[PDB]
Structures are given as C-alpha cells and as structure tokens.
Ligand binder design. Sequence first.
Ligand SMILES: Nc1ncnc2c1ncn2[C@@H]1O[C@H](COP(=O)(O)OP(=O)(O)OP(=O)(O)O)[C@@H](O)[C@H]1O
Ligand SMILES: *[B]([O])([O])[C]([C][C]([C])[C])[N]C(=O)[C]([C]C1=[C][C]=[C][C]=[C]1)[N]C(=O)C1=[C]N=[C][C]=N1
Ligand SMILES: *[B]([O])([O])[C]([C][C]([C])[C])[N]C(=O)[C]([C]C1=[C][C]=[C][C]=[C]1)[N]C(=O)C1=[C]N=[C][C]=N1
Ligand SMILES: *[B]([O])([O])[C]([C][C]([C])[C])[N]C(=O)[C]([C]C1=[C][C]=[C][C]=[C]1)[N]C(=O)C1=[C]N=[C][C]=N1
Ligand SMILES: Nc1ncnc2c1ncn2[C@@H]1O[C@H](COP(=O)(O)OP(=O)(O)O)[C@@H](O)[C@H]1O
Ligand SMILES: [Mg+2]
Lengths: 517, 520, 350, 173
Amino acid sequence: FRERLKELVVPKHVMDVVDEELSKLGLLDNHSSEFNVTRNYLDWLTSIPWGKYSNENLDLARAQAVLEEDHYGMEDVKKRILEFIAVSQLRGSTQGKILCFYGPPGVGKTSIARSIARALNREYFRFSVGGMTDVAEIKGHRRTYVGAMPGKIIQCLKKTKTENPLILIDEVDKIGRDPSSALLELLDPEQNANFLDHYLDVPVDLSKVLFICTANVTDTIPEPLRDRMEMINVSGYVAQEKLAIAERYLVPQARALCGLDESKAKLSSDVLTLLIKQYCRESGVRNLQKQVEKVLRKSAYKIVSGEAESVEVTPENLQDFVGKPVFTVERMYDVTPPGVVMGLAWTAMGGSTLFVETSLRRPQDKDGSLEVTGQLGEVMKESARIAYTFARAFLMQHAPANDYLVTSHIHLHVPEGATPKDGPSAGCTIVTALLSLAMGRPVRQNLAMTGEVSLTGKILPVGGIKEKTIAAKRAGVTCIVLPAENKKDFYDLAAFITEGLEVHFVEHYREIFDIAF
Amino acid sequence: DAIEEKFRERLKELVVPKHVMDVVDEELSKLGLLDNHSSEFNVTRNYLDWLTSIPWGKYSNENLDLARAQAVLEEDHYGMEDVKKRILEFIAVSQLRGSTQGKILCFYGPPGVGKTSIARSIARALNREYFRFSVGGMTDVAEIKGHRRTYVGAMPGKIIQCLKKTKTENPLILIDEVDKIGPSSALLELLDPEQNANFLDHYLDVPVDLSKVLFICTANVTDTIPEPLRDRMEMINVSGYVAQEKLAIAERYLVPQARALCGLDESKAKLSSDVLTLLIKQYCRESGVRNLQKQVEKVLRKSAYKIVSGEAESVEVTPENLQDFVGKPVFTVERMYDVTPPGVVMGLAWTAMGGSTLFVETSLRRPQKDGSLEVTGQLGEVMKESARIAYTFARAFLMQHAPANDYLVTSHIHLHVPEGATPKDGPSAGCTIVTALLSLAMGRPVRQNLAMTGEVSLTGKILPVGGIKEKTIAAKRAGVTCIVLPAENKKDFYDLAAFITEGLEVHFVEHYREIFDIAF
Amino acid sequence: VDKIGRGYQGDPSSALLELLDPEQNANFLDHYLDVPVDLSKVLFICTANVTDTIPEPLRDRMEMINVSGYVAQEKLAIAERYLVPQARALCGLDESKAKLSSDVLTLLIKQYCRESGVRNLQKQVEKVLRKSAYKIVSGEAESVEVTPENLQDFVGKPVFTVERMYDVTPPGVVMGLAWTAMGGSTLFVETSLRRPQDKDGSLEVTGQLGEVMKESARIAYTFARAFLMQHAPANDYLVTSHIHLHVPEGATPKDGPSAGCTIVTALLSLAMGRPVRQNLAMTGEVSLTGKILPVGGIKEKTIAAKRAGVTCIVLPAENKKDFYDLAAFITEGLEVHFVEHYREIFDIAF
Amino acid sequence: VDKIGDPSSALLELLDPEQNANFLDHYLDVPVDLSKVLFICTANVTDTIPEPLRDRMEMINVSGYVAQEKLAIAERYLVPQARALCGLDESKAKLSSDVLTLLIKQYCRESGVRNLQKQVEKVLRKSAYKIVSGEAESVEVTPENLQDFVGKPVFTVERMYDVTPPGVVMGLA
Ligand SMILES: Nc1ncnc2c1ncn2[C@@H]1O[C@H](COP(=O)(O)OP(=O)(O)OP(=O)(O)O)[C@@H](O)[C@H]1O
Ligand SMILES: *[B]([O])([O])[C]([C][C]([C])[C])[N]C(=O)[C]([C]C1=[C][C]=[C][C]=[C]1)[N]C(=O)C1=[C]N=[C][C]=N1
Ligand SMILES: *[B]([O])([O])[C]([C][C]([C])[C])[N]C(=O)[C]([C]C1=[C][C]=[C][C]=[C]1)[N]C(=O)C1=[C]N=[C][C]=N1
Ligand SMILES: *[B]([O])([O])[C]([C][C]([C])[C])[N]C(=O)[C]([C]C1=[C][C]=[C][C]=[C]1)[N]C(=O)C1=[C]N=[C][C]=N1
Ligand SMILES: Nc1ncnc2c1ncn2[C@@H]1O[C@H](COP(=O)(O)OP(=O)(O)O)[C@@H](O)[C@H]1O
Ligand SMILES: [Mg+2]
C-alpha cells in the first residue's frame, strides 16, 4: 500500500493521482472489474521508483580496468566512456547521453554495453526495436482496454528500480511502418524530462538514462534519429586480432558454457587460425564463436560418451569436429591475365575484393562499343562510360597508333554476376583494365586500386578506406593505389594493419599508369 | 456526491460561456443518477473531468514592454532579424489595440538554424505558455480532432490536451514539421481565422475559442505543404548563417553552453577565435550551427578528460593541437581545378547545406554524319534538357562566329559533371555548358578565376536563377574573382552584405554574347 | 466535402448520400434515434475547391454553383472597402495615422498579390499596417505615409516584374498565352535550326512538356509541313531541316492541347525567315487538317495578354461567347480576331 | 513459437533462468520454481519479431528427406498408423514397396511427409470402402491401379529429351 512510497521521493502531481485513485479504490467494492483495474493502476504507480538513483562509481582507473579486461580493442568506445565519466565527475551529478555504435555483425557492440553498465555500476536493460510496428510497445496501452500493460520502459524503471539504468536499444536499423516518432521523443533531450506513458498518464523523467543504440549501417536509421545521437565506429578485426579475441575470450567462455575446463579440452592456436582463415569469412567473430562452440560441444560429448578422457584439437583431426574447409580460395585470380584488374569494394558486412574482367566481343583489332554486365548500378555504369572515354583519350595521347578501344568491341564484366554492386569507385580500375587489354599487358601481380576518375583523368576520393584496406590485406596484396585526398583516412589505420602494404597516393591517372606498368 | 462539488469548484475562477455551462449542468444532473460501478458513470465522469480542465477564460498576463522583450530576444539567439522584427510588431499591435491577439506564422529554413528554439525564446519574451506539438509523419486525424466519448480509447486530441496543460487560453503552440505530415485537412480548420473561433474537438462536442493562440509552424521547404495550408499561414524565412555569423554564435552561445553542459569553467577550457574559425571552415559543412555544436562539445569533453584524469590543470586549444581533439580536417580542398583545361568551366550550385562549386568537363569520345553529345553525372531531366538547349545554341553561335570551325556538328562529345555519385538537377548551368562546349571547340580555356550561373534559352537569352547568396558565398570561398550573373538577379546580388560582394568583379548579362566576350 | 477521408475503416461520403437526398431527406434515419427526422427544410451548403473528388452520385444531389476568383479591379475594391477597414479594426490604427492610397493598393496588387483568392492581399495589407503601428507606438514617428516608392520598405521586393521575355520577336519565336493560378501567364515558343544545313528532317522538343503538348507539337509539325508545301511549294524547309523547339523557362512543367497554332506559326516563321507581328499573342488547338479548336481559360489568357502589352489577340471562333462574357474593362483595347481555320491566323500574322 | 502475437516479453522473461525460480502466476499468489523444467520450442522460419530470443534460443535445423528416407519412413511409421486410424490391417489392404516409391516419386515431392500421409490415408479409405461395400474381400494396390485411388499423377517423365540433338544441353535447377 502506502508503504511502497515512503522510501521514494514522490513528485506532487503523481501524489494527487495516487490519492484520487486511492479514493476511487476505497469507494469501489471487491470482486468487481473496476476494483481490479484501479488495483493494477495503483500497483504500477507505486512500483515506479520516483526519487532514487543508483550509486554510480565515477572512479576513472577502476572503470578503465573494468573495460580493458573484458573486451579487446574498441578504443573509441572506451575513450568516450572515460570522457563521460570525467564529465559526470565535473558536473557532480549523474548525467545521461545518447550513444550509437555502428559496425559489421559481431564486433562487440552488444557486449560492450553490458561491460559498460558494469563499469559505471548502473543497472542494465536491453530490448530491440527491430520488428515492432505499433507504438504501444513503448508508450503502453491505455488503462481502459480489456488487456492493459504499461509498455516497455515503465517495465525497465520498475524492474531495475532506478532512474538511470543504461537502457540498450539493440538493432535500431530495423523499424516497422512510423514508431520513429516515439523513438525520437524517447531519444530527445527536450522530450525526455517528460515522457507521459499512455497507461499511466503521469510523466516520468528520462534525462539521466544512458541510451546506447547499436546498428549495422547508419543510412537505414531515420535522418531525425541521426542527429540525437553520436556515432562511434566499432570496426572489424584482422586475423591476429580475431585470434587474440578467440584465445582470450571465446574459448574460455564457450568452454565454461559447455562444462569442460582447460585440461579436458584444448584448442591450439593453429586450430584457431584454421577456423579463422578457412572455416570463417567475416569481419566479426560471430561465426568463429559458433565454430568454437561446435568444437567444444563435440568434445564434451566425446568426453561423457567415454571415447576419451581429454581431447586436443589439432589441425590433423579438426575435420572430425567441423568437417571440410569451406572458403579455400581467398581470391578469384592468382595471376591476372592481360584483361583483369583487382578492385576493392565494401559494404555493411565489411570489406571485399573483386576483379574487373574485359574481353573482345567480336574478332578483329564504324566505332567500337562497350557492353557492361555484372548487375551494376546506374552510378557504376556512368563511371564505366567515363572510364571508357578517358581510356580512349589516354591511349591516343600515349600510343597514338594502337587504334584499339576505338574500333574494338569490348565486353566488361565484374564477376559474381548475381550480387548487385554500385558506386563511383573502380573508375581507375576500369581504366586500367581497358588499357591493359588494349596493350596486351598484365598489370602488376599483387596490386589493388580504388578511386573515382573524372573525364580529364583526375582521381577523386572514395569511401571506406579502412574496410577496403582490411580486405586487400587479407586477400594478400602488396601494392595499393589510393586517391591523394584519402591519405588522412589511410594514416588513421593501426600500425599493424598497414605493415606489408606498399602505398601510392595519386592525383591524376598518369601516376596510376606509371605504377601499374 | 463530493465529485459534484469538485467539478463545481473548478469553474469558480473561470468565466464559462453559456453553452459550456448548459452542457456541464446536463452532464452533472445525469451523473447524479448513475451507479458508481457501471461504465456510464466512468465515461460521464471522464467527460466532466475534461470539460472543467479547460481554461474557459484564463488568459496569461503578457509582457507588452517593447524594450524588455527586445532585450529578451536579443540575448537568447543571434541575428534572427525577421523573426524578431515580426514579434516586435506583434507586441506593438497588441499594445496599440490594448487586447491580446493571435496569429499563425510559419518559420521555414535549413536545418539547425534555431527555428524550434526561437519559439521558446519568444514564449518567454511574451510571457505566454509554450507547448510542443510534432506533426512530422503523422497519419491519424484523431490526434487533432479526437474520438467520440463512445469509444474506449478516446482522448480529446492534442489541442485540448494543450489547453489543459498550459492552463491559459492564449498559449504559444509550436506545430512542428508541417512539411513532413503524412490528416492535413484538420489543420485547415485548426488554423483558419474564420473557423478558428469555434474549434470542434470530437471528444468534447463543445466548441473552443483558439482565436488568441499564437501558432508557429516550422518547415524546411514550402513545396510539400498543401496549397490551402500555405494559404492559411504567414511565411517567414529563417536562412542559414555565413561564416561570420557562425563565429559569433559559437563565441557567444555555443561555447558557454557547452562548458555549462560539460561542467567546465572558462579558465579551465579555452577556445580561441582561430580554432572556432578552423572548425567552422573545415570540420563542418552545413547552413546552421548543429554539427558545430557537436564539435565544440567533443573538444570540451576531451578537455574535461585531460583535466579530471590528471594530465593538466588547464587546456588551451590552438589551431596546431586541434588535431588531438577532433582528428584531421574533413573539408580541406575548396576547389577541384586550379587551372582549367581548354574544355572545363566552373559552375555554381546550392542546397540546404549552403552552396557548392562544380565543374563542367567536356572532351572527345571519338577521334577527329553529324556529332553527338553524351552527358553523364547523375543529371535530372531538367538538367539534361538544359544540356540539349546548350548544345543547340552552341552549334548556332559557333556557326555565326567562326563559320569554318566544323566542330560541334561533326564531333562526338562526352560531357561530365564530376562527383558522379551525386545527383544534380536544375535549369542553371546552361551558360556554363555553352561555355564548356565553345571552349572545347575553339581550343581555348576560359578566364582562370571565373564562375557563371544562368539559364540559357534557345536563342541565347540568359534567364534568372535562384540562390544568389549561396552561389556567391561558394564562389568567394573557392577563390573566384570574377562572377557572371543574369541581369535580372542584379537586385538579389546587390541586396547582399558588403563583406560578401567585396572583391568580386561581377558582370550582369542578358544575352550570351556578353558572357562570351567576358570569358574570352 | 471534397476532403472527407475514405479510410480503410469508414467512408462517410456514402453516409452523406442519404443526408443530402432531395427526396429522401424527409425521413433521415439516425442510428441512435431509430426514428426518421424531416430534414427537407434545412439549407445545406457545401464548400469545395475541386469538384472531381466528390463521387458522382453525391455530386448529383448538390446544386454546384461557382465562386470564381477576382481580377485586379475587383481585388482593389475588396481591399479598400473591406480589408483595409477590417485591418485597421484589428491592428487598432486609424485612417488618419496611416493611409493606403489607391495607387499604393493598385501597385501592391499588381506586383505582389496575383492569385485568385484575396487571402494573401489581406496579409500584405496587415503587414504594412503592423509595420506602421510599430513605427508609431515606438516613437520613431507620429504618423506614417506609404507611397509607391517606400512600399518596398514595408513588404519587401516585388514578386512579379517582367511580364515579357521577348520585347521584339526574332524570326523564330511567337508569343503564346497560358493559364496559371497566379493570373494568366505569357510564354514564347522558340525554334532553331539544330544542324548546319537547311534523309528527311526532324523535330526535337524541350521545356518540360506533357504528353498532350508533345502530341500537339507533332500535329503542328505535320500540318506546318503540309501548309508550307501548299503555300510555297519550293521552300523545302521543314522537310529536310532538323529543328529544335523550346518553350522557355525550361524548369516549369507545362501541358495542354493549346499552342497548336503557336507552334505552327513558330515553324512557319522560322521557315520563311519572317517575324510575326510584334504585338500579337494567340492561343488555339490545331487539328491535322488545320481546324482551330476551342480552348479554355479565356479570361486569364486575355488578362495576361492585356497585361503584357499585347495589342492584337487571336482566338478560336468557338470562344466568342467566352470572350464576350468578359467584363468591359478586360477586353476594351484589344483587337481580337476569331478564326476557324489556320489560314486566317497566317493572314493575320503576316 | 513463430506464430505468436504482450506474449513476446512474457516468454522472454519465462525462459530466463534468473527469473525462472520465481514465476508468480496471477491465480496462485505463491511463486513456483520452474528451474528444473526443460523447454523446447519449434518453428518453421526464424523471421519472428524478437531478436533477443534468438540470442537465448539455440537454433537447430531439421532438413528434408530424400525419396529413400521418405519411403523408409512410410513403411515403418506412416502406413501402420494410417491402418490403425482406418481400422484395417496388413492382411486386408497391403501397400507394397514399389507402389509406395511410385506414390512418393509422382505425388509427394516436398521436404516433409505431410502430403504422403494424406495420400496413404486416401488409399486406405478407398480400400475400406472397397472391402465393406463388397467390391473385393481384400484389396491389393499395384502401380497399375494406384490412380484409381489417388487420381492423376502430379509429376511426369522428367526427361524432355532422351537423346540430345546438337543444340540442346541439360542443366540443373
Ligand atoms: N542564431 C542563434 N543564436 C543562438 N543559438 C542558435 C542560433 N542558431 C542556432 N542556435 C542553436 O542551435 C541549436 C539547435 O537549433 P534548432 O534545433 O532550433 O534548429 P532547427 O532549425 O529547429 O532544426 P530543425 O529544423 O531540424 O528542427 C539550439 O541549441 C540553438 O541554441
Ligand atoms: B566504391 O567505393 O564506390 C565501390 C566500387 C565497387 C563497385 C568496385 N562501391 C562499393 O564498394 C559498394 C558500396 C558503395 C560505395 C559507394 C557508393 C555506393 C555503394 N559495395 C559493393 O558494390 C559490393 C558489391 N558486392 C559485394 C560487396 N560490396
Ligand atoms: B542550377 O541552379 O539550376 C544548378 C545547376 C547545377 C547542377 C550547376 N542546380 C542546383 O543548384 C541544384 C539545386 C536546384 C536548383 C534548381 C532546381 C532544382 C534543384 N543543386 C545541385 O544540383 C547540387 C549538386 N551537388 C551538390 C549540391 N547541389
Ligand atoms: B493551353 O491552354 O492548354 C496551355 C498551353 C500552353 C503551354 C501554351 N496550357 C495551360 O494553360 C496549362 C493549364 C492547362 C490548361 C488546359 C489544359 C491543360 C492544362 N498551364 C501551363 O501550361 C503553364 C505554363 N507555364 C506556367 C504554368 N503553367
Ligand atoms: N573484443 C572482443 N572481446 C570479446 N568478445 C568479442 C569482442 N568483439 C566481439 N566479441 C563477441 O561478439 C559477440 C557480440 O557481437 P554483437 O556486437 O552482438 O554483434 P551484432 O549485435 O552486430 O550481431 C559476442 O559473442 C562477443 O563475445
Ligand atoms: Mg525544428
């Protein structure tokens, strides 16, 4: 009854509400519907914590030791959390921000939230806005409908019993059809102080909550939401990074979940590099986690079934635990013919490498044409047209007797003809492929290039230098050609990502021609 | 019975009209006959709760001191001249007629230019009550007009809830994002001085008097607003700020507020004007100070960390060490061509994020039966048709000027506008395309620091264009020293601040012959 | 009534079919009363902007009567007889403290307020009046006068200033008239040789033309060929030349079956190397054999012609009733020629 | 579980092993420990609304059956149960192996046995009628009268060509 509120610091308006609802409760009689609906209303109103904050430890070094020990890498998230702690110290009060991590699947966006709430000692709640289409799942129903529930944030405040509980909203890319309004008001510093749930009319404060959001790509998020939160990039890992993550975090966790311990089941680091290079193709450690779980589960069975008293997974018997090595190519061409050139692409899942093939379409050396296939977007077809024009101009100025590309009928294809692809990059790639076909020369053998081209030959910047460079390193390239204006993007990469890479920053195509031949 | 007294007491400080009093008496006498357990009693008590929580005569005591209100406005925002002049005229009229009043305004402009915050500043300057009301993406008319008492989940809609929350009958309601409304025929009644005096909410079933509410709508564009709704409300433009205004805003409003938000002191964290100019010029590219606020907050956060953690006792940010806080510059090019080849010409464009500079490149698709022109660069249909017009006029002009050229009628040309991923549109760049074609044909480059904008017709007439301010700013920023505008944009250009048109040798033209004699 | 929601759950425009039945109003059955109520003595008045959005069964029960817009003279009368006095009653000013002379109001209508309604004129009037009130109550003045020179200091910069692209027409252009919501509008039709020689010819059109207008261009091109063949059988222009036709202001979309005669005249003037009469607008749909067919919006087109300084207007002969139903001040100084076939337009224009 | 309608958060809380020990139901005010019950859930597509379920739910994929496995299933489990349901027995109505392979190959090609079950029930109902009415004191189904029981074959010869001319080549879909 009224004892659930003597520990709470109840506001005045909600005090009037609970008083008038107590009057209604007392005037009504038992075993009646109205009695029960008022009972539920008052129970919900007296279950909300109206004045309490969780004791938040603003100690810097302890929180840094907490964060740095349960998650590898991810410097941006930890730096932002430490600055958050510093600002909370200076302000003297417990404050709240709105953050958003975006990155490929399985890079720690969800577990870093839990470790963060453990560091700040706040509570923790998670709920996904993925498939929801009606706003009553957040704002709640109304007290009049036959089945009435107060939503999914009042439930947070009730079960956590706090006013700053670090709500994590997973997967805000997926949104039905628009609850984005309720989302924004929930994620707005001007609409947070008063929330006004639908079930219980009285508003509640949310300006102390720490809203963390996780997405895979920023563009599917509504533009209104793309301004009420900061954007921290959680990036994918490399082979050695994945291996460190595996050894230090995945094997212990999966093992302690399966029941075994360090003696009864081991995984040599060579087995882990096998499960990384071949049995997995990703920028995260999700499928790697599944593979390690499968290995340890079969190990647990072989233990309990009495086939062996301890298992040591080696490269010699990994097949008995996972089967055959999918992904045993790692790049289409090993030695490129005169017509094909390696290019770099990227997407939300991470970087990727692709090739641009050219060929003659009719048997000779009335102008030539250029067929283009490969499920290419409109921008990519226009870039191919620009590349064709500039390649003809360049071949005329450099080898005025070739006559190729002027009388020849060419066909240009980008393999994997099933997957669609777009973008203004690979213009320099298309120019290089056409010129190498016209000259009958193959380009340097481990070489990838990325960069937009213009009708006069200038090389314009591109995007996603980090992921493209990761993919080029993984595909085993030694040289790489970039636009000169992406130097600042390239030199933000860690020192171990750009070790065996010979880099060239160019402004005009003549430099790319000098490099590729 | 005590609820009869509670309802009859709420209407003591109110001057209730006659029809509302009739409805209240009927509903009270009806409530005095129901059973406290039936749903009829619940719905009648809800009706009498909503009927008495309307401020039937309660007005707020507005501040009508012009000097006090001007001082309030001038110390909350910066340079919103038209909005402040409008509110001062509003006060002047309310003072000259002695009674309160209501209007329906619409502030429209690019994002982040303080449209939705000047509303709160005005509500404070006027001593009104402020209410937020978002309409973007709304689809249900029952949010404006409500449902009957009959239905279960029945609320009286947003305006009645406003009147109940603000407790005054002349609040300031900010109908936000009327250009993105999904439903809009209810607003035709909400804000229409004819019907406005008797607004019928479907729940109350008794008309309210919104004739003294100051409605303020915000939008980014006026093209997506229905024509009658644009006919109802008054449009007031809130344009984006130039670099100097952005600097003044950062120095006066953004850095102090971000220090307050980060819990700093002025002695601890300092940002010189050079650092702020560097931010504005290189780390953010938009019309209003919205990303600049984020950059300032980031710098101050990293300063707070360097202090609390124990690095230093004071942080003094310089244009040198600014990298250690926000990283490397983002927009440090300012121009694609330094010396234009014989076939490229610099044009001007603009968007909601300010103005831009783009070049029109041309070249030969085939060596040395007529010619063709292939255009690429993600051009809209208007831009492609302008390219066709430019091609035809360039052919005719070169025929009349150099009759023995034979170019432009026998050559196959490719025309490109770089940044091939960016979609472009608009009838301008006609003169730019004509100049590109003629320069490629004659083998001559244009004047070296020259930008031109203007729609061309089939006989060579230069027609007016839009966004002279933004194009002029972008040309000045890109190091342009000669600008060629249409003659009918002369007043648009001369109504610009003196610090924009300072070092620009401008030329106003009517026919293309004048542009040709300039550019060559 | 043209804005009722036809939602997934609810179509009230079908429940109106009983409320507005001239014969079945006498027994209108409400679902709460369950007793028919005689409604045949009620004066129902509906208001709409567009008529086609009302279902035909419903549109048949109403007596649709039209409330047209206002021409400049009616707008000036409305202003100085209802708007300025009401604006003064609102802003609490007096006739003696700020006077809006008829010259100022005429200029304000001519340059700023051009649509059919009278709702923007109200806003400009009260803008002037509130700026005067702020000058007065702030002590910057004790009385304000608004003249046609300091008007731009009150309302801003004019919105309409040119009214005419070409003042003297070259051998390829010809003036046509259009219907707009902001009064009428004048537009020209430019034609130009596209290739360096006077294997057949071709016509390319630009200017954001609708489908009906492109078809009108095709028909006008065919008839222009036929007419120039019968008239000057040795011209050979329009048969082997590559023409480009442009309706300037290439950003705004334009449509309609009019401008047939305009396009024929443009092509013929280009072929003969002759400009048309220097103050001559024309409008009319042409057919494949040359017949000039009726058009719409005669009031607006005539207003726009008279406003752009046109002295000779040409209309189809079946628009004579439309033209002579216009007020006396609209059609007083215009030499109008009504035509049935195109040959008459050719004789007028040359 | 993917045909569920708030029941989503209710299940999300129920399956949780930290809220498992205290499951207070609205009828019994007394809590009950459910930390010893074993929960299994089945579905057909993993495109249901809650994603944090799939974080706690361990997905296992039950693939289809090739024709041999379907025939073995039909001979061992399906036909006995259908006989039990129709009241027949192996002496009265017999379904040989070749007729079952024919039935699978020409009528039921999906990944499950939902269609083959209805087909064998159809055969057994026709057989029950034939033995009760008196057309035959015992029925023997054979690949030359199965259509008299189930109607026309659904699938066909599967080879448009037997010997390919110079132009045509067989691909697989
Ligand atoms: N001239 C100015 N003076 C002071 N502050 C300003 C000014 N312009 C913008 N701001 C600041 O910008 C911030 C946000 O601006 P606001 O959200 O009002 O922009 P907006 O135009 O409403 O954006 P949107 O159209 O997207 O709603 C406010 O905190 C405000 O202080
Ligand atoms: B480039 O950076 O623009 C690049 C060119 C690529 C087609 C060789 N495009 C991409 O990488 C796109 C993403 C994108 C970039 C820029 C604009 C629009 C889209 N990714 C892909 O095309 C792709 C295709 N298959 C697999 C992975 N990624
Ligand atoms: B012009 O004013 O028409 C201009 C031509 C430009 C492509 C050289 N176009 C634009 O300025 C458009 C805005 C617009 C104006 C008029 C009608 C429709 C649209 N802006 C852009 O195309 C653009 C492209 N890239 C970056 C920024 N703006
Ligand atoms: B005509 O009367 O059809 C005319 C042809 C004009 C392009 C020379 N068209 C219009 O008047 C249209 C309205 C219309 C009337 C009748 C049928 C279809 C359409 N208006 C416009 O074309 C226009 C032109 N410029 C600006 C705005 N509107
Ligand atoms: N640095 C890391 N240390 C430990 N675990 C990691 C790390 N990076 C990723 N993981 C693993 O990734 C998984 C979480 O991925 P998540 O961020 O949920 O991806 P998504 O939400 O995009 O599917 C966890 O199993 C976690 O163990
Ligand atoms: Mg706004």
